[PDB]
Amino acid sequence: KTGLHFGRLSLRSLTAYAPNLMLWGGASMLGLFVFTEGWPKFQD
Amino acid sequence: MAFRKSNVYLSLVNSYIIDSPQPSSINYWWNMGSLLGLCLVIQIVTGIFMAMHYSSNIELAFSSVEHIMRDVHNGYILRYLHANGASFFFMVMFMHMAKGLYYGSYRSPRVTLWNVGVIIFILTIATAFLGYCCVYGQMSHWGATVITNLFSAIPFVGNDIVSWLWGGFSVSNPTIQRFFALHYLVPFIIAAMVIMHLMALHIHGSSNPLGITGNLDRIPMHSYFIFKDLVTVFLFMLILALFVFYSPNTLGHPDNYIPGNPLVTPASIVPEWYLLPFYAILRSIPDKLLGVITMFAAILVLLVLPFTDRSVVRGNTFKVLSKFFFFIFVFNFVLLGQIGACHVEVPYVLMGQIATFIYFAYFLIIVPVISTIENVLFYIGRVNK
Amino acid sequence: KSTYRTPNFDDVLKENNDADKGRSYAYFMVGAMGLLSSAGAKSTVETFISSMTATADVLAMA
Amino acid sequence: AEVTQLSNGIVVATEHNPSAHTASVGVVFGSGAANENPYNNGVSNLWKNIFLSKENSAVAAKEGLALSSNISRDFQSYIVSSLPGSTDKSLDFLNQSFIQQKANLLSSSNFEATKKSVLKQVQDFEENDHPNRVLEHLHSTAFQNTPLSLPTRGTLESLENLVVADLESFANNHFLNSNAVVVGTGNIKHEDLVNSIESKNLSLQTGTKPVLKKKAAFLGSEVRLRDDTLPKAWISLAVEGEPVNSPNYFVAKLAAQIFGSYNAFEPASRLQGIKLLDNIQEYQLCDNFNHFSLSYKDSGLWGFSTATRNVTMIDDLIHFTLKQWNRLTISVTDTEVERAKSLLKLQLGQLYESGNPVNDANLLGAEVLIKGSKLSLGEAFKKIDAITVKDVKAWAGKRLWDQDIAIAGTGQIEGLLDYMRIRSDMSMMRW
Amino acid sequence: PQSFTSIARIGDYILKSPVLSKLCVPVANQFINLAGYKKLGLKFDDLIAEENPIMQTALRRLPEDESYARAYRIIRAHQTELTHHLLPRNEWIKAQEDVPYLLPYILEAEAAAKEKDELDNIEVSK
Amino acid sequence: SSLYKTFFKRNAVFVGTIFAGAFVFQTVFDTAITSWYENHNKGKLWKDVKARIA
Ligand SMILES: CCCCCCCCCCCCCCCCCC(=O)OC[C@H](COP(=O)(O)OCCN)OC(=O)CCCCCCCCCCCCC
Ligand code: HEM
Ligand code: HEM
Ligand SMILES: COc1c(O)c(C)c(C/C=C(\C)CC/C=C(\C)CC/C=C(/C)CC/C=C(\C)CC/C=C(\C)CCC=C(C)C)c(O)c1OC
Ligand SMILES: CCCCCCCCCCCCCCC(=O)O[C@H](COC(=O)CCCCCCCCCCCC)COP(=O)(O)O
């Protein structure tokens, strides 16, 4: 049988990146706390 | 080989304006790109020679526009060639974004060319606005007050952005004095994004009004479309010279000759006539946060146009339904430039809400639906089964 | 001399390669240069961005 | 087929196969080209050719015996083929070529006429076999200053110093009783092979081959035999793979079966299930590649060799196949393993269980020297039918993800980019 | 971007039904000559945009005698539209000469790139 | 050691350690350089001159 593809990004190539893309969303959330902490913006 | 090909500089001139193979069937709508190149040099040269006399303080802004129009030799020419020529920029450009929307110039392989179009269009809206607030008239103080108070709707970062943007607590001396050094600059960013716009065009070449391949019959640019552009250069110079010498303050608002006073509000604050459609989209949503988004979404909905056009034929030239519904979109865009001028009154709120639904249902609902029906009708009209 | 006899690289080679260590004595000193260039490009942005904020004599008239 | 072993100081291996019509009988030593110093390098390539010399082969052809030998990195081999009714005649010849005597082959007429024959074979190999002299330069720069670096053919600058006294000093140190396995493949019974060696003596030497104090160690490097007067540009590129007798033996072969091999002129090697072909066929970046997993005794290699005429776009051939190597760590699919199982189960069945009994005697001889016995094909299919996609990903981050590579190239390799723009492709930076 | 396999799946459903063929095939005929590519001297399969690689493939599988005439009716259209005229009424493409000559070269290149992607995502059930 | 696997292997967690290591370097190095600069200039600052006005 054929998995769900829709062009390039198939589901099997997306389930293997979603563990790592959860880390890029943390490595960019800490990317904001370097460039904003220095003017009062409280994130919680 | 020839020196126009053998030099490092002249081969950029050669491959762009002399030997560039243009399709031999392009009509006069393909001159609007050459007019916008001329109309950009008109704004820039009549910006440098005008900013040698302009002081940008809030006390000497409006008093030194009148110093240009009264005390400088041919100063009335410069201020009127450039306040009206900026309003001719947006009329040629609106006919340049509507050639490409009609003849299918947004489709692949020219999606890179279309996306630099929307980026140039946003910087040109932002340039002509930032120079409008440099005259410090009554419509320009209360224009900058209404526009930069829309960013006070972003949650929890609203007031800190606006107070950074004003450079104070209201539209005061640091706002006008920074709306000039910015407005001096962004034309040189447009003049670099235009060079990044000819590079996206030069790899695949121009389209042609039939929508078929133009690799068969190609004629050069020199002495053929150089002299087909000189017709519309000398015509655009003519219709500009009527609007500069014979009727110069027709397009602008009369309230912009009142010196800007923050204590007295005018009767109805409107922007200049070309931002008037988007001002009617902004005013249509009965919310402040969604209005800033939808007025910005209305420029960014041009980007979903290469992916919503479901046609195997490039352009609307040989299509009945997708040529009718295109001119409904154009005359809807003119109507939004009219509800932007009327007050917030019955029934210009039911109109401005309906006629902003037709702005968005063109790209998202009409163009995918009537171009799928225009492909089954091209098929079952010929195939006999 | 043949081309199968490699010359004397012994004066520059390490005494123990251990590729979990050599890629950690070298991603430290790349990561340390990245750390000061992220604490040094915050201050370069925050210098120019805070220059556009409300100046001193505007704040006195608040 | 079931192999069988027995030892009395001289270990005897047999794989009886009654449906064949020949019977190879040979002695396989465990001291190949990785047991020589660079001053006697080529003495095992020269011990092959005086076994196959014209004087000695004509004596063998009188009884109907064809001779064959093989000089690899770690094992040598000396096989005598025959008809199945004539196996004891092959041992009687093999006894009187090595064991009973070596002075007839090492005469002054037969030596200098054979050393001149090898010295032409290497000089022909050095400038005409281009995809193989790179793979012998890849070993010479991955394992440099280390006994796995020495070429099996022997260098020409070191081969013209050999006298007979170096041919015999290698014989008294490595052609020993505690080093050899006597293999019999093809139509021969293990009871007939053991009783025939017991009916004769066939005692080679005493024992205690030397120790080889250096151990093989990978050292990431490069070598560029740049030479513009060639039509193509041959390139091999390899990381440190797995040695034999390792738990990651079959995963290193299955990972080299995922990217497989390719030949641009065949119309059926272009439709394979490799994802690399979608990037490599657009501008025709290469003519052929093959992914190998070589596994020697102390260390190994893993990588790919290639050859291309598109010498201006080599740096997209390298970059597009090194990005596919990164997918083994991160996002190798389940189907891309499940075809590489079924291709590895085939091209092992086409290797251990093909026709030729000369080739089956080298594989049986190379196996029972290193790991004491032969792992059967029916029980090496269970090891390939159990490799999951976690085991390939756990192996790939061990050996492939951001590791040092060894490069060797010849031809028009000006377009081949520098080291640190090839080494930097092993780690994706976007993961 | 409409993938002619999908057009012909819809389009053959219309022509097969007796009710819809009586209804919207005369609408389709009046839509064709109102478009007026015949008046420029083109068939429909000159109008299809040739920049996707599926349509770039099907213009190589075309025979020489049809790819020479197709490369002429395009140049007669770039010459007619340049003069802002139409072709004279004898030179117009008639109804019978407007046949889908390039349709079967596309439906065998579309189904050959659909099979290339249905097979590049196959999941083998163990 | 196994320091490579947790920190330097995935680039998403390598650069997430650069930014979380620069968020601590901003707050600490600024306080460590302020508290030295005033301690080297003890007696000249306004916080000390305001204490002499007793
Ligand atoms: C941010 C979003 C931007 C969107 C921009 C919205 C539109 C901006 C308004 C500018 C109007 C520009 C209109 C230009 C229309 C595109 C050009 C065009 O389509 O002209 C060609 C058309 C038919 O010509 P064909 O080439 O298809 O036929 C060939 C047959 N051999 O020729 C014609 O059918 C006649 C063209 C008549 C143009 C009428 C323009 C009306 C302008 C409004 C005035 C309002 C006053 C009431
Ligand atoms: C894309 C290019 C430009 C556009 C669309 C543009 C547009 C405008 C507009 C709409 C105004 C307000 C006119 C009015 O209401 O009187 C204006 C004013 C002005 N602009 Fe530009 N401008 C452009 C480029 C430039 C450049 C390059 C400069 C300076 C070097 C410049 C300097 C000025 C100045 C000094 C004013 C003074 C106010 C006035 O007298 O109108 N402009 N511009
Ligand atoms: C300062 C503003 C601009 C300049 C100088 C400029 C310049 C040009 C020029 C010289 C051409 C070639 C002539 C032609 O094809 O008409 C061109 C083509 C094009 N421009 Fe622009 N442009 C500008 C703004 C825009 C904008 C705002 C858009 C769309 C949102 C746009 C979209 C296009 C497209 C789609 C084409 C290709 C049309 C075709 O050849 O089929 N441009 N541009
Ligand atoms: C695809 O084929 C093409 C094509 O290749 C091109 C180039 C064009 C033409 C388009 C352009 C040329 C647009 C490019 C526009 C720019 C690059 C803008 C640059 C304009 C400037 C005016 C540059 C700024 C320089 C100055 C202002 C210097 C002037 C000096 C002043 C004012 C100071 C004077 C002081 C003293 C003391 C004399 C086409 O129209 C076209 O289609 C036919
Ligand atoms: C830079 C911003 C875009 C500006 C758009 C202008 C596009 C058209 C440029 C026209 C230049 C004409 C030169 C052609 C040429 O030299 O051909 C020359 C001779 O042509 C002529 O003699 C034309 C007479 C001079 C025309 C003067 C026009 C100046 C108006 C300037 C308005 C635009 C700034 C060679 O032509 P030939 O090869 O056919 O022999």
mmCIF file of C-alpha atoms in Angstrom, chain B residues 236-342:
data_model
loop_
_atom_site.group_PDB
_atom_site.id
_atom_site.type_symbol
_atom_site.label_atom_id
_atom_site.label_comp_id
_atom_site.label_asym_id
_atom_site.label_seq_id
_atom_site.Cartn_x
_atom_site.Cartn_y
_atom_site.Cartn_z
ATOM 1 C CA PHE B 236 3.227 59.499 -19.690
ATOM 2 C CA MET B 237 5.274 62.692 -19.711
ATOM 3 C CA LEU B 238 2.331 64.416 -21.396
ATOM 4 C CA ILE B 239 -0.398 63.330 -18.978
ATOM 5 C CA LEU B 240 1.929 64.153 -16.100
ATOM 6 C CA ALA B 241 2.547 67.642 -17.485
ATOM 7 C CA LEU B 242 -1.176 68.372 -17.612
ATOM 8 C CA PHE B 243 -1.484 67.302 -13.981
ATOM 9 C CA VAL B 244 1.531 69.415 -12.962
ATOM 10 C CA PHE B 245 1.098 72.735 -14.752
ATOM 11 C CA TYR B 246 -2.622 72.960 -15.444
ATOM 12 C CA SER B 247 -4.257 71.245 -12.492
ATOM 13 C CA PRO B 248 -1.678 70.377 -9.840
ATOM 14 C CA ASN B 249 -3.770 70.038 -6.669
ATOM 15 C CA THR B 250 -6.509 67.897 -8.177
ATOM 16 C CA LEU B 251 -5.391 64.574 -6.751
ATOM 17 C CA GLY B 252 -4.325 65.700 -3.287
ATOM 18 C CA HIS B 253 -6.580 66.593 -0.398
ATOM 19 C CA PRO B 254 -7.258 70.279 0.324
ATOM 20 C CA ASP B 255 -6.847 69.816 4.082
ATOM 21 C CA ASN B 256 -3.136 69.109 3.672
ATOM 22 C CA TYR B 257 -2.517 72.849 3.265
ATOM 23 C CA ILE B 258 -3.660 73.525 6.816
ATOM 24 C CA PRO B 259 -0.594 73.378 9.100
ATOM 25 C CA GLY B 260 -0.834 70.310 11.276
ATOM 26 C CA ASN B 261 -2.430 70.973 14.646
ATOM 27 C CA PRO B 262 -2.778 68.100 17.146
ATOM 28 C CA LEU B 263 -5.494 69.900 19.097
ATOM 29 C CA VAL B 264 -8.119 70.187 16.343
ATOM 30 C CA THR B 265 -9.228 67.086 14.497
ATOM 31 C CA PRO B 266 -10.344 67.478 10.870
ATOM 32 C CA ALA B 267 -13.748 66.562 9.505
ATOM 33 C CA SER B 268 -12.815 63.186 8.023
ATOM 34 C CA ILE B 269 -9.262 61.860 7.958
ATOM 35 C CA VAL B 270 -8.589 60.011 4.720
ATOM 36 C CA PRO B 271 -5.222 58.883 3.318
ATOM 37 C CA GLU B 272 -4.105 59.800 -0.161
ATOM 38 C CA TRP B 273 -6.259 58.309 -2.909
ATOM 39 C CA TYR B 274 -4.227 55.166 -3.602
ATOM 40 C CA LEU B 275 -4.218 53.823 -0.042
ATOM 41 C CA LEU B 276 -7.976 54.405 0.002
ATOM 42 C CA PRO B 277 -8.964 50.805 -0.963
ATOM 43 C CA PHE B 278 -6.905 49.262 1.836
ATOM 44 C CA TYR B 279 -8.230 51.900 4.226
ATOM 45 C CA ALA B 280 -11.713 50.627 3.412
ATOM 46 C CA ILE B 281 -10.651 47.053 4.166
ATOM 47 C CA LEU B 282 -9.128 48.177 7.466
ATOM 48 C CA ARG B 283 -12.325 50.018 8.366
ATOM 49 C CA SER B 284 -14.636 47.152 7.437
ATOM 50 C CA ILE B 285 -13.809 44.747 10.279
ATOM 51 C CA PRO B 286 -15.573 45.794 13.521
ATOM 52 C CA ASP B 287 -12.456 45.037 15.575
ATOM 53 C CA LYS B 288 -9.080 46.653 15.930
ATOM 54 C CA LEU B 289 -6.796 43.616 16.013
ATOM 55 C CA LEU B 290 -8.367 41.878 13.026
ATOM 56 C CA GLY B 291 -8.295 45.116 11.053
ATOM 57 C CA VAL B 292 -4.509 45.395 11.180
ATOM 58 C CA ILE B 293 -4.218 41.789 10.018
ATOM 59 C CA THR B 294 -6.796 41.951 7.219
ATOM 60 C CA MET B 295 -5.382 45.214 5.867
ATOM 61 C CA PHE B 296 -2.024 43.425 5.783
ATOM 62 C CA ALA B 297 -3.562 40.186 4.520
ATOM 63 C CA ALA B 298 -5.003 42.051 1.534
ATOM 64 C CA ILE B 299 -1.495 42.607 0.152
ATOM 65 C CA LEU B 300 -0.314 39.129 1.100
ATOM 66 C CA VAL B 301 -3.278 37.384 -0.541
ATOM 67 C CA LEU B 302 -1.567 38.077 -3.853
ATOM 68 C CA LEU B 303 0.925 35.372 -2.897
ATOM 69 C CA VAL B 304 -1.654 32.550 -2.897
ATOM 70 C CA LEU B 305 -2.514 33.393 -6.496
ATOM 71 C CA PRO B 306 0.066 31.076 -8.195
ATOM 72 C CA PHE B 307 -1.312 28.154 -6.184
ATOM 73 C CA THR B 308 -5.037 28.835 -6.590
ATOM 74 C CA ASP B 309 -5.076 29.304 -10.368
ATOM 75 C CA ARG B 310 -6.031 25.808 -11.543
ATOM 76 C CA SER B 311 -5.810 26.500 -15.268
ATOM 77 C CA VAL B 312 -3.742 24.664 -17.845
ATOM 78 C CA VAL B 313 -3.865 27.799 -20.037
ATOM 79 C CA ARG B 314 -1.735 30.782 -19.059
ATOM 80 C CA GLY B 315 -3.785 33.952 -18.739
ATOM 81 C CA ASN B 316 -7.349 35.071 -19.316
ATOM 82 C CA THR B 317 -7.007 35.948 -23.012
ATOM 83 C CA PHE B 318 -8.917 32.973 -24.437
ATOM 84 C CA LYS B 319 -11.361 32.529 -21.571
ATOM 85 C CA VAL B 320 -14.916 33.794 -21.316
ATOM 86 C CA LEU B 321 -15.709 33.411 -17.625
ATOM 87 C CA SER B 322 -12.270 34.279 -16.254
ATOM 88 C CA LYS B 323 -12.256 37.498 -18.248
ATOM 89 C CA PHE B 324 -15.674 38.591 -17.011
ATOM 90 C CA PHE B 325 -14.862 37.920 -13.356
ATOM 91 C CA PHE B 326 -11.560 39.735 -13.695
ATOM 92 C CA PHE B 327 -13.237 43.028 -14.521
ATOM 93 C CA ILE B 328 -15.640 42.522 -11.644
ATOM 94 C CA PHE B 329 -12.536 42.402 -9.452
ATOM 95 C CA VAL B 330 -11.114 45.597 -10.959
ATOM 96 C CA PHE B 331 -14.345 47.534 -10.572
ATOM 97 C CA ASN B 332 -14.660 46.139 -7.071
ATOM 98 C CA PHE B 333 -11.218 47.522 -6.331
ATOM 99 C CA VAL B 334 -12.337 50.938 -7.566
ATOM 100 C CA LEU B 335 -15.423 50.771 -5.349
ATOM 101 C CA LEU B 336 -13.235 50.052 -2.325
ATOM 102 C CA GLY B 337 -11.351 53.198 -3.243
ATOM 103 C CA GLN B 338 -14.670 55.005 -2.922
ATOM 104 C CA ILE B 339 -16.015 53.559 0.330
ATOM 105 C CA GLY B 340 -12.646 54.555 1.767
ATOM 106 C CA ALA B 341 -13.541 58.180 1.023
ATOM 107 C CA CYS B 342 -17.108 58.164 2.336
#
